[PDB]
């Protein structure tokens, strides 16, 4: 959970440019860890 989630806390410390954009959830069966932006998260603070 968090050893994937710290990477999203490390994504909160950003350097990395993502070039082309499509829908993420079509590639849900591709990633190792998925988080979902829903306007807020009480954990990220």
């Amino acid at each position: 959970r968090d050893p994937p989630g710290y990477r999203y806390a490390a994504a909160i410390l950003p350097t990395g440019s993502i070039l082309s954009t499509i829908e993420v959830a079509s590639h849900r069966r591709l990633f190792d860890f998925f988080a979902a932006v829903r306007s807020d998260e009480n954990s990220l603070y």
Partner: protein, 49 residues
């Protein structure tokens, strides 16, 4: 009588040492020189889209 054998020549090639950066495939990949994978356990990359 005289009868002799003649090594009329010797030829060789060279191992054409291709360099991976001298190659059209090189923009598919950020090839990074990180000499410390041996003591490493694991890395992660997070993504914020």
């Amino acid at each position: 009588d005289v009868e002799f054998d003649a090594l009329l020549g010797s030829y060789c090639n060279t191992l054409s040492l291709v360099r991976f950066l001298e190659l059209g495939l090189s923009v598919a990949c950020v090839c990074t020189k990180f000499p410390e994978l041996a003591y490493m356990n694991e890395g992660r990359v997070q993504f914020e889209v």
